């Protein structure tokens, strides 16, 4: 099934857009995605929770 | 240092090309993700495409 690649591309693309991450946080999410791409939906939700809590 | 800097910088430059559409931005970002050493060629290609899709 395509859910795996589809979910991985979504996580990479959205984390790239999250405005309230810093570069070290963004790159840490990117490296986790490379290390375990099966976790991409959870990593996206971590990144988005984190991005929302860091909003101005 | 940063094992993801070349992807992160080029990906940020891809998505800000205002005349590319969403499927195009997504395809260059996934090419960079898989092949960050091609970042300068992929950016050149993305920029060429962007300016060919401007109204002028």
- CATH code where residue A46 lies: 1.20.5.420
Instruction: Suggest the residue from A23, A24, A29 to mutate for an interface test with chain B (most B CBs closer than 10 A).
Output: A23
> What tokens does A1 get?
């099934």
Q: B12: nearest CA in chain A?
A: A16
Chain A residue at shortest CA distance from B4: A27
* Cα dist from B2 to B8, B19, B25, whole Å: 10, 30, 23
Q: Which residue of A has its CA nearest to B5?
A: A27
Q: Report the Cα–Cα distance between both ends of chain B, in Å, rounded.
A: 42
CB B39 within 8 A of CB B10: yes
Q: Residue B24 is encoded by which pair of tokens?
A: 């195009």
* C-alpha A55 chain-centroid distance: 16
A26–chain B Cβ distance below 8 A for any pair = yes
Measured between alpha carbons, how far is B35 from B56 in angstroms, rounded to an integer? 31
Domain count, chain B: 1
* DSSP 8-state symbol, B54: S
B51 to chain A, closest Cα gap in Å: 22
Query: B9 and B27 in contact (C-beta within 8 Å)?
Result: no
Tell whether A45 lies on the interface with B, counting CB pairs under 8 A: no
Cα dist from B27 to A46, B2, B22, B44, whole Å = 24, 23, 9, 14
Question: Which range of residues forms the domain containing residue B20?
Answer: 4-56
| Documented resolution in Å | 1.9
Name all contacts of A51-55 with Cβ < 8 Å and 24+ positions apart. Answer: A51/A18, A51/A19, A51/A20, A51/A21, A52/A20, A54/A20, A54/A21, A55/A20
C-alpha span between B46 and A15 (Å, rounded):
20
């Amino acid at each position: 099934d395509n859910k795996f690649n589809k979910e991985l591309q979504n996580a990479i693309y959205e984390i790239l857009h999250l405005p309230n991450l810093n570069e070290e946080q963004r790159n840490a999410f990117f490296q986790s995605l490379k290390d375990d791409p099966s976790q991409s939906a959870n990593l996206l939700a971590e990144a988005k929770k984190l991005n929302d809590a860091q909003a101005p």
